[PDB]
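Margin note from the TA: students keep mixing up input and output lines. Inputs are the sequences; the output is the structure of the whole complex. Example:
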Amino acid sequence: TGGRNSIRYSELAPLFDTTRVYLVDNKSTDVASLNYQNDHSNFLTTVIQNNDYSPGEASTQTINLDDRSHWGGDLKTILHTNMPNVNEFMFTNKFKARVMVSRSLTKDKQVELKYEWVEFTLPEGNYSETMTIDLMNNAIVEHYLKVGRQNGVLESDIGVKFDTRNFRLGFDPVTGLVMPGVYTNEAFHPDIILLPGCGVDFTHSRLSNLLGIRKRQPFQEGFRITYDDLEGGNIPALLDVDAYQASLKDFATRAEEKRAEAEPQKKPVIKPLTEDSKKRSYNLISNDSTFTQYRSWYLAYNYGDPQTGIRSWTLLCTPDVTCGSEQVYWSLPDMMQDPVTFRSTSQISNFPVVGAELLPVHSKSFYNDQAVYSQLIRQFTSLTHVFNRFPENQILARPPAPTITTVSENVPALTDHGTLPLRNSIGGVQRVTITDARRRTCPYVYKALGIVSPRVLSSR
Amino acid sequence: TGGRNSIRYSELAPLFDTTRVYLVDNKSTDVASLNYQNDHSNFLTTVIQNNDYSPGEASTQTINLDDRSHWGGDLKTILHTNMPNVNEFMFTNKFKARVMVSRSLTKDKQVELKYEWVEFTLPEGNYSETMTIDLMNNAIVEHYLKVGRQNGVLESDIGVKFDTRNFRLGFDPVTGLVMPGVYTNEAFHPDIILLPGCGVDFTHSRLSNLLGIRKRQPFQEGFRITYDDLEGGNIPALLDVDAYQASLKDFATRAEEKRAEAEPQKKPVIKPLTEDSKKRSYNLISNDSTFTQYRSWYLAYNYGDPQTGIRSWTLLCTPDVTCGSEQVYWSLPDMMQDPVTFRSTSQISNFPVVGAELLPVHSKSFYNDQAVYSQLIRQFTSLTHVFNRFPENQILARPPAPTITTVSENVPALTDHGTLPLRNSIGGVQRVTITDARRRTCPYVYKALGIVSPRVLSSR
Amino acid sequence: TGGRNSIRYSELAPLFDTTRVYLVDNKSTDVASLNYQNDHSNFLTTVIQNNDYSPGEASTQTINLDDRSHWGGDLKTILHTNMPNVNEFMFTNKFKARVMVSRSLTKDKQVELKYEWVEFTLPEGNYSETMTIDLMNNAIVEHYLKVGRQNGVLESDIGVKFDTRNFRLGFDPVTGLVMPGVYTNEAFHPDIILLPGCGVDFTHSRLSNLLGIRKRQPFQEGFRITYDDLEGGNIPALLDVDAYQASLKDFATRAEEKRAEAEPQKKPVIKPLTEDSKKRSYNLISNDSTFTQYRSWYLAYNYGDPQTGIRSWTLLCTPDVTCGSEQVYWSLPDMMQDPVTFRSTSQISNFPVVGAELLPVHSKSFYNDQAVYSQLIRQFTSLTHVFNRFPENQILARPPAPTITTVSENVPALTDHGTLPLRNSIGGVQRVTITDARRRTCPYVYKALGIVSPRVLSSR
Amino acid sequence: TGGRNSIRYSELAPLFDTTRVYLVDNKSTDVASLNYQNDHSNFLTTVIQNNDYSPGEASTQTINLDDRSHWGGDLKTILHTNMPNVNEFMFTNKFKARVMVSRSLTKDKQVELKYEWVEFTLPEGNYSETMTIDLMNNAIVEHYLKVGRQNGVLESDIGVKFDTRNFRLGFDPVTGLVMPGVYTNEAFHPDIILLPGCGVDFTHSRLSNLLGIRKRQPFQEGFRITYDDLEGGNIPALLDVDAYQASLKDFATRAEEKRAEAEPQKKPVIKPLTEDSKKRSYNLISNDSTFTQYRSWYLAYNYGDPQTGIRSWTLLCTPDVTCGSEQVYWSLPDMMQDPVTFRSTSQISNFPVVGAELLPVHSKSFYNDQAVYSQLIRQFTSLTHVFNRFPENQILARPPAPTITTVSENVPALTDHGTLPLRNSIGGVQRVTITDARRRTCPYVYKALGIVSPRVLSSR
């Protein structure tokens, strides 16, 4: 310490031992003159807080930490964003899926079904865990319109759907059917329902995470999940409720009558429904088999061979609307020594990093009353949303709203990076820069604030 | 340390090493006598906590940190506000918009439409993310009354509306219409709906942030968004439900009948509704085109040319009721050495700063049940609010309440600034001062509290 | 300090005193080349952040903390998971129970009841405190179908049920019956209802904790709870409401008439209901006794002999959906000295541990409105869920939804382990590894992030 | 430092300066062999984390902090419980009350009323702020059955009730009655309603706190609150609505008609109802007085003489379901020097204490919709709960559910005790022990975890 303290500035007098320099954006004189063309994630600040000098002029003067000692400063920072759930940047507004795009009776008498991969995009915005799903299903439909239908494609065969129920709860081990005649619409994790000849790929989208279907060994570029993959676990068919109902015309310890009332002339059972009001085909494999051609991921993962099925190369897990906690990197190139192996440069997308921190986004959870409220309004017929374009379908229906939805929420992060080594000649104008994992500014930054407290560390 | 500790006061005896001085407002003797004309964001305190002296008299005595050493103190502080969502100070109660103000059949046979920019102001108060919007739409209307109407202006042409839905979900790629005959009223981010010849400017309002429409490169003084800007993305027109309904009088794998039931004598389709009950014009460009003159920001941003549209110079992002996390600056001029480049002065609006901190305001989020509850009460006719003065309009209607509203909430902030260098002759009366980004006291401060713990740092 | 600081790298120049090395997974060049076959819970990272070298090549270079001093580093870390409530890994998707599997009239005239232990498994997913229960009851039923029934087993005798009410609130001390004729369906802690000859074992499942039935002295491998254990506390029988109703044909201080209206020809009381609509046996011990054979844990614990009953060897406590706060262990084998007694090795499942921390999972609680809403919909008959397959049973009914449900929620954990001693020759490529209590990678890890700040500790 | 660092272990080599020893329960080898008969609140751990030695054998080896220096360690700990709201341990399942137990027409013509103190106990479980109350009222009733009634006791005179409303809002200053004929059922703090000759004592129960009736000077063993105490503040009687209704047969500034319409032949007023449907006596003092014999604490405290009433020796305050934040004490007898005045021993219930911390329980609050929902279901007659056995009573009714209920919630506590002095010969097997205020293990502990970081403090 002794003679090694002195923190000096032009004529303003000797200041001794730690003090404070401030890195701020909202400084009025600065804006107008320096970072006009820049944004909150990469700006310039005049660190000289002296009322009497031009910003330019200030950019000349310097804060001089005493020369005789190696100095260090404590860097506390306040980061605040407002990035939305889905958007083009975080890759949460795009996702490739393969759908039916044409259906025509080929030249002889056999038929033709051609499929193709199309990229659907969502309208940017901050959504729910669910409404997002919906937005996706809609984006599938919206395409079926501009193309599908007007080429022999019947809704009765739209290839991909993102639903959320266990399509085999009512299932009866012997009848081979979902007895209650209705797939019990309770929500149990996002799922993916495919059809023959198609599938979906998330190779370039974090939406995968929103669904909560993660690859069992991530560092593998590429995420395609097709029909052939979802093996074992095709949605069983609903039993014909009416056919069954309409039919039926042609120890001794109180356990006596209970054992005789519980027990050629066959019944209407066997009849697995085939279509629904407005006759929508449920595409059943055989006029025999109780299983529909529709295949569910959830079903696969949980019910089909664990050592071979998707349960093998994939992993079932929690949703997370945020799509993935990603971090950001601070850099104060003009004011702090470049950490260990970092090379010193001027290429904004490669500056040295002084602090890392998670991008300020959490997921708040709320209890959903609207879960059932809706089961008592479409049972009492009325208009439809662009979401339930197939009310009477039990499959292309509208995935049940899960109780407890999550919502991406932005929050101020009063973080604190360690104490770093800094130069002893701090320039009048410092440059602040926040970067993301991929190394690029981040448009969604409303406020960055830095406070540095230099203090002597050793001697030269 | 050795002889360098001694912290002395008048005759009260030697105290050694760190101790504690207190900066408090609520001190009774002080109020009455010193900071009568001041407020919590800029007051005087007697730091001498000795029961026997006048405040004035105390203002004489002094705490003497030993002379032989440079001292420093730890400054912990308790800040607590209660600033409201919208108000004149934070510039959240004003916003300029350009509306229709006159409509008369000019002198020959052609007509005249004159527009003007008017500043509307809100009643101060703490609001919701939504009700705020509403308050704005109302403030637009309230003006149409004092002027608009009484000058040939028909509601059928009020220029600006802040709604919240995706005005083109039901849209059908071929019919060029919102088929369901009703813009699906679900909430998807605040938006701005304009008309020809008008627009809105936020150049002097943080309300912009409330909406969540941020300028892609902020440091540009000025925020005007007009009709001509919102290009490509005019709200498509609702299809005539009745005209259509009223009309209609004059492979082989179960997929056989599904491919024949899905497939001069033209139909009522083409008819895009023109007005609504009480005949309100939907101002359609041509008696032909399926698009209304009404233009939506949301629509533009998401659907019209990304490299040219507003999607270019603007950015879609999360709301935030608070309107923008702003920070405040502490200053203890009379008790702590003036940080690096700060000049020492007496101009309250330029004191030295010792600590920065975010102004104590966060946004709590809640789940909205009232989302739909209201769709089942205006469907069952009854009175109206100053908010839905055009129930039967599908456009000047009332923006749908988003599920999950946010509310600005004030909270005590037990913050902690570093350890700062201080003078060794602390005056009997210290002056505390909290300032905002622009540098001015902040009326909304209920309590400021400071605790300082001096301790030796080096030697002289 | 003096000559002991120097932190050196290849030619890049001398850095002095603490600096920062970064342990990150999401680093792009790394993924592709090193940890292709690995996962977030056990990967390799290149700690050399120098743009110009191959990852391989970098793996050669080294960060050299000065040799003359023993160094240490501060390890802060960011861990973020997404593990679901129930799953095979945490052992929350399996649980052994003993049920009735066969009922046939043995060879002479006496009968045979054979029971067996079967393991039921749940569909993996993140659930509620309740819906989980339900999933279990269902899994019991689902078995009764594939086997039970089709072998003389009547629902009237399914052995295990997980409900949640105090099966003896309405109980009347004298009549020996649940007077109101209905077990008051309010929720009061998960319970277990057994039958003669069966029970449940959790020896290999944390689901026990979900129920909130903990063993009074845990370190005892094994958790079997059978009928014979639940002694004293058999669910009393519901009084015959109708029999009773249908019958009844054949001081003086205002307290006079109150003392005469409150006061061979016997009444219908004695009649304890025996079965319910669709005549389901309530299996009553004697044609006499007011107690059914059904036995409840809750009942036992709270009402039967505390010094002998289950209240003795077991403990009643709060649920917790997470099933048990378990911790994880960090290990940075290639960069930090192996703590006290740890042996140095290469067996991933035995690396040295540098930091311990709770696996990032908490339980959020919400208020349940859906508590009663359902009591006003099954009272108005309509379809049933795979959950209430015995609506009219008062016992095999559907446990009442408790107000205040809990839900396992994943959250980012910005933790901070101490300051650790490290090697002075940090390899170009470090290995990160998170392990669980049992010592194995943890599939449910989305992001691991490490920041180390070396700084001199002493001298060599 | 110099030669004073060395932290040594058997042959495993010299480790220098701070390192880390771990205190963990879940360690597999340990359980089976050492703490079989113990529980999480008092177990043994092998601190030697070396894979090759028996636990027993390890118990021999030792960690040797260098002898030449006095060492200290940082103790961070992770405590996690799951204790329920009410239970026998925390004394929240018992509470003595004095009730009517016999009513017979004594030998001459005068009568006899004998009362007695009885201890009622609740079924263990985690409850609500309210449902707890209810459970208590029920427990009062449940007794009236096994005894009361069957001895001339009419519900019309059950002595104690815990309700929650201000039994005198409708009250009219002149009529001396609760005009609206109904005690306005809004919730305003737990209360206690007594009758002549009885009362309640909490001398041995924290439930008092749940109610929120605290003794004004706590350190006084004993908490009895009887009738005679609740003086001034007897619940006024409801006015006879019918008698009144059934009767009535036999300046000039617009303020003219308002002053004549607002103004022998007496009216039905005076008639204060006496009993209610099913004629339940309201026990009124005189056939005259408008006050019933029923006395309320709330009423007393707020309305009767503040200098003499209960308002004097008692204190009205917030509920808190937890019943009282109690703390726990850590102790690591075998590894850390015994703090200042603590005597060293082997009596588990007197070990030295190294850290204190609040027992991990907080109270979450939720908004109650179910507040009114119930006022619109018992107004539409139907069955009753064991809770509203006197629907038609306005007093023995069922206390109104307060909006905003609280619920005891268990939470992991990542606490951190200071840095403590420790022995330099740490035994292979350490003993961990958590104790409560009264000094006894705490059954409700699911996980205890300790991390110690020794580091040199001075020299010997």
